[PDB]
Amino acid sequence: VTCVSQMPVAEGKSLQQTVELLTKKLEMLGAEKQGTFCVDCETYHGKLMYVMHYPLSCFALFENGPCLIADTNFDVLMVKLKGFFQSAKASKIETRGTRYQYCDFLVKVGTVTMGPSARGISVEVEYGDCWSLLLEFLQSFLGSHAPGAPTVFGNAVYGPADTMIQYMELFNKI
Amino acid sequence: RVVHRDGRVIMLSHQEQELQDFLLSQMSQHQVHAVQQLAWQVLSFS
Amino acid sequence: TALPALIVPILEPECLHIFVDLHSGMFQLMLYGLDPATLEDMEKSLNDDMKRIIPWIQQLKFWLGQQRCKQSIKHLPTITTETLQLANYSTHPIGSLSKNKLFIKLTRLPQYYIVVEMLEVPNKPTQLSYNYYFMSVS
Amino acid sequence: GVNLEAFSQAISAIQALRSSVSRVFDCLKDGMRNKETLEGREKAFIANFQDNLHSVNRDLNELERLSNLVGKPSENHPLHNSGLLSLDPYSQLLQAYKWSNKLQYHAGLASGLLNQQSLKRSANQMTTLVLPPQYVDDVISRIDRMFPEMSIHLSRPNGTSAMLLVTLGKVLKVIVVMRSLFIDRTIVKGYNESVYTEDGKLDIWSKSSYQVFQKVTDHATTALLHYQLPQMPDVVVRSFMTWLRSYIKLFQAPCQRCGKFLQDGLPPTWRDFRTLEA
Numbered sequence: 051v052t053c054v055s056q057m058p059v060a061e062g063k064s065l066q067q068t069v070e071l072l073t074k075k076l077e078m079l080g081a082e083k084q085g086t087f088c089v090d091c092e093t094y095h096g097k098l099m100y101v102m103h104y105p106l107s108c109f110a111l112f113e114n115g116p117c118l119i120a121d122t123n124f125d126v127l128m129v130k131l132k133g134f135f136q137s138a139k140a141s142k143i144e145t146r147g148t149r150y151q152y153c154d155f156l157v158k159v160g161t162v163t164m165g166p167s168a169r170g171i172s173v174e175v176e177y178g179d180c181w182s183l184l185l186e187f188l189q190s191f192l193g194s195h196a197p198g199a200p201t202v203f204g205n206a207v208y209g210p211a212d213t214m215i216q217y218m219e220l221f222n223k224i
Numbered sequence: 225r226v227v228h229r230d231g232r233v234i235m236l237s238h239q240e241q242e243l244q245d246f247l248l249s250q251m252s253q254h255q256v257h258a259v260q261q262l263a264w265q266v267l268s269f270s
Numbered sequence: 271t272a273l274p275a276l277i278v279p280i281l282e283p284e285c286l287h288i289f290v291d292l293h294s295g296m297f298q299l300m301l302y303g304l305d306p307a308t309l310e311d312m313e314k315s316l317n318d319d320m321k322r323i324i325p326w327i328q329q330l331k332f333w334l335g336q337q338r339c340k341q342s343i344k345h346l347p348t349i350t351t352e353t354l355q356l357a358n359y360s361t362h363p364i365g366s367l368s369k370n371k372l373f374i375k376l377t378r379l380p381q382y383y384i385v386v387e388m389l390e391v392p393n394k395p396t397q398l399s400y401n402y403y404f405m406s407v408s
Numbered sequence: 409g410v411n412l413e414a415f416s417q418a419i420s421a422i423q424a425l426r427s428s429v430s431r432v433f434d435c436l437k438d439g440m441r442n443k444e445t446l447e448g449r450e451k452a453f454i455a456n457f458q459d460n461l462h463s464v465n466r467d468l469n470e471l472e473r474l475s476n477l478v479g480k481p482s483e484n485h486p487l488h489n490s491g492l493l494s495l496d497p498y499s500q501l502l503q504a505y506k507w508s509n510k511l512q513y514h515a516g517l518a519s520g521l522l523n524q525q526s527l528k529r530s531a532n533q534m535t536t537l538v539l540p541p542q543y544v545d546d547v548i549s550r551i552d553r554m555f556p557e558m559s560i561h562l563s564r565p566n567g568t569s570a571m572l573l574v575t576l577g578k579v580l581k582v583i584v585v586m587r588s589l590f591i592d593r594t595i596v597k598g599y600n601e602s603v604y605t606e607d608g609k610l611d612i613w614s615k616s617s618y619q620v621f622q623k624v625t626d627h628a629t630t631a632l633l634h635y636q637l638p639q640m641p642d643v644v645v646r647s648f649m650t651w652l653r654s655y656i657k658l659f660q661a662p663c664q665r666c667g668k669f670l671q672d673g674l675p676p677t678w679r680d681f682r683t684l685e686a
Contacts, residue, residue, distance in 0.1 A: 051599075154618070155670075176598070176599070177578060177598075178578045180659070183659070187667065189667075231623060231674075374685045378664070
């Protein structure tokens with residue numbers, strides 16, 4: 051279902067220009083503006099915050115997606131433990147970007163936050179496995195990439211909103 | 225929306241459905257095919 | 271015109287009805303068909319300027335011509351598109367904003383079929399004479 | 409298992425093992441009648457010799473053979489022989505054992521050739537095609553549930569007509585609301601988009617999906633409108649179930665690449681492939 055994101059393998063020019071070329075290729079494929087989203091990140095010495103689609107925020111050091119409430123429910127907990135668990139170091143980079151839809155799918159590319167950051171892309175699926183066919187789409191998008199590495203052998207099944215943990219892997223690339 | 229055999233969905237208006245006549249012609253042809261299969265059966269070049 | 275509001279044709283045969291908001295400005299309109307959330311821009315333009323009508327007229331002409339084409343060709347096995355998506359040898363085809371249809375029953379994609387009506391008919395807001403051209407690229 | 413039938417082919421194999429060598433010596437029974445074109449005739453001899461290699465292949469044929477042996481040797485067949493002389497005048501039954509099989513096998517051809525029917529008419533020769541008893545529905549439900557790994561359920565909250573839902577490996581459940589006997593007017597969705605257990609308040613219709621299964625729903629409607637045989641509604645619903653079973657994988661993509669559209673499926677020919685091409 052929720053396919054994992056991928057690092058921006060394409061790196062031959064300006065990151066902004068690279069994202070622009072990727073979006074131009076996507077438009078050449080043929081899509082429509084489905085809005086713009088973001089992916090936040092806040093580390094606390096290591097609970098890593100997150101936000102995606104979208105009326106719900108998430109934060110987890112190592113858990114199977116314990117988030118089912120809005121940021122307010124979580125931000126209040128953080129503010130309450132201002133000296134107990136508040137270990138907010140230098141603000142972790144957070145990406146953003148528009149999202150388009152070729153056909154019956156969704157695409158989303160990321161952006162840099164401080165400037166020397168990545169601009170990776172993320173895609174998902176609509177089935178419940180089936181990692182083979184979804185790769186073909188990316189074959190039409192770029193060259194060899196997207197190793198995936200999902201939580202295989204679980205279907206704790208279908209990885210519902212657990213892909214944010216995979217998003218943490220993208221945060222590891224720094 | 226309508227599907228005869230192959231998911232041929234088309235949109236239309238209040239009083240424009242003359243495709244029915246085309247369906248009648250195709251049904252006539254298919255009936256010729258069927259009766260040929262009944263009684264020497266020619267190929268399926270219809 | 272009519273009793274509730276006015277009426278304007280787009281072709282020379284039904285479509286493109288426009289009425290007025292009896293409680294405010296920005297008189298609405300609705301052409302039976304497709305392309306939603308796009309006519310709203312036309313609505314805004316008429317509400318603001320009320321002068322620029324003929325560009326939307328030509329646009330609606332193109333749109334409904336292509337719509338009629340597709341609605342009549344959608345009985346045989348085919349598929350529609352908006353461009354050939356490959357201008358390899360930009361020498362054979364030439365023209366303007368056009369349409370294109372393809373087919374499966376003969377083969378996957380041996381030869382597409384790009385077609386365009388002869389827009390801007392002489393002294394005729396309609397009847398673009400529907401020019402036809404065949405191509406044999408692969 | 410049923411691999412024993414393979415040994416039958418092996419029989420024919422060793423048959424050639426005889427014929428081959430005969431075909432050898434027969435070829436040596438006479439010389440060149442009139443070549444006049446080439447000396448491949450002698451090579452022709454070696455040609456027959458080549459077929460002798462087939463014999464070695466027979467020995468290879470045993471590699472795939474010998475899967476496993478079944479318990480209780482003799483398979484309860486000669487138990488009748490253990491009877492006294494009184495039982496021996498009984499082989500007749502065994503003969504019928506084959507005969508009955510032949511019967512079925514005969515029908516296996518006959519019914520097959522019955523496919524080409526000759527019913528020039530089907531009316532003006534008589535009734536109540538709609539099944540009166542509200543128990544044959546449960547019978548068909550049980551027959552369908554006899555199929556493994558494919559669960560079927562039904563509640564029928566609307567009334568006399570039949571209403572049912574089916575689930576598969578994925579969450580692409582199918583809701584079929586049809587008349588008393590034959591299946592018609594069904595729909596499909598995926599991932600709780602229908603949730604026809606207690607949708608809103610009950611097994612709702614909602615006539616919707618996110619533009620992925622709609623084509624599959626239309627194709628299933630077409631299949632229902634096409635498989636409506638004049639009689640034997642059980643056969644009709646069984647064919648419908650078999651057709652539905654063909655989507656349990658959604659993995660392959662022949663006669664095209666897996667990028668033509670959202671998905672690909674139209675198997676009325678007992679085999680799925682790239683859609684929008686038939």
